[PDB]
Amino acid sequence: VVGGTEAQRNSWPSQISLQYRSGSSWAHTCGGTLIRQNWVMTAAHCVDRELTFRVVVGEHNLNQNNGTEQYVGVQKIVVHPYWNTDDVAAGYDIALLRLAQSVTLNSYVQLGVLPRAGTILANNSPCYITGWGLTRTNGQLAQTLQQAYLPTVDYAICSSSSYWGSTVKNSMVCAGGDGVRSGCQGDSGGPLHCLVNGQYAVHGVTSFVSRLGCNVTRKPTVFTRVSAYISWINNVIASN
Ligand code: NA
């Protein structure tokens, strides 16, 4: 997250760190959201590589013992069947991970609440992105979980020629684009949290930014719109 601030350690208890085994250690690669005690939602492009993955819940500082982490292997990966890795702009950038064990819930570990199917945010709706991604374009991962305020940019604007044009679809949410705050590498798969009727819900799964940089004016961060995939998510969990 570029232009973020450190999150309080109990603000975003559905955030997870998806990590891969890297020699004798583990490395953060992307974010995700806990949606059942044994299921995580992330981006499809995050699990394109044939790596050994684990999920960490209750994480705050990737480089220090927080005393709150639970570590759990990934048992099954279900990517959306229409996902195509060489066309992220087509959409369907979503995947569900079944965990080897069910995690225990507490003030650091909670299920993300999802929006009702079909919900679309009005333009300029207040949202936060969260994650451990790069803190500058071509920078390094954050140590501590970051948050940045990214108001939504509606489809009519986002799909205009000076923004994303045809690259943005109605199955996506755009947020940000002010040139200072954005998602960045390592934030993929993590949540966009939006405040609606007094309650934060996860409306987006971080999908892409510009190839010209993370925080680029009129290139808001693009998220998979969770509310377009409620039936899909429910169908996968019920059949696994
Ligand atoms: Na930690």
Judgement on whether residues 29 and 131 belong to the same structural domain of the protein: no
Separation of alpha carbons 85 and 98, rounded Å: 21
Separation of alpha carbons 103 and 70, rounded Å: 7
Please report where in the chains the tokens 């987006």 appear, as a residue: 204
* Number of domains composing the chain: 2
Judgement on whether residues 69 and 122 belong to the same structural domain of the protein: no
Q: Which residues contact 161 (CB under 8 A, 6 or more apart)?
A: none
Please tell me which residue in 159, 188, 207, 227 is annotated as part of the active site.
188
Q: Taking a C-beta distance cutoff of 8 angstroms, is the pair 81, 96 a contact?
A: no
188 is catalytic: yes
Q: Taking a C-beta distance cutoff of 8 angstroms, is the pair 77, 49 a contact?
A: no
Judgement on whether residues 107 and 122 belong to the same structural domain of the protein: no
Cα(92) to ligand 1 centroid in Å equals: 31
34 vs 29, 89, 140, 168, CA distance in Å? 16, 25, 25, 26
Separation of alpha carbons 219 and 176, rounded Å: 8
Task: Compute the C-alpha angle 79/209/146, nearest 5°.
Answer: 90
Judgement on whether residues 222 and 238 belong to the same structural domain of the protein: no
Residue 108, CB-side half-sphere exposure with 13 Å CA sphere: 17
Residue 49, CB-side half-sphere exposure with 13 Å CA sphere: 11
48 is catalytic: no
Cα(68) to ligand 1 centroid in Å equals: 8
CA neighbor of 208 nearest in space, from 193, 192, 224, 194: 224
Cα(25) to ligand 1 centroid in Å equals: 14
Per the structure block, which two tokens stand in for 180? 């200072």
Q: Which residues are annotated as a binding site for Ca(2+)?
A: 59, 61, 64, 69
* Helix ranges, the chain (H): 155-158, 230-238
Judgement on whether residues 198 and 134 belong to the same structural domain of the protein: yes
Cα(199) to ligand 1 centroid in Å equals: 27
Domain of 22, in residue numbers: 13-111+228-240
How far is CA 62 from its chain centroid? 17
Instruction: Assign residue 128 the CATH number of its domain.
Output: 2.40.10.10
45 is catalytic: yes
Task: Compute the C-alpha angle 129/204/228, nearest 5°.
Answer: 170
Judgement on whether residues 83 and 118 belong to the same structural domain of the protein: no
How far is CA 217 from its chain centroid? 21
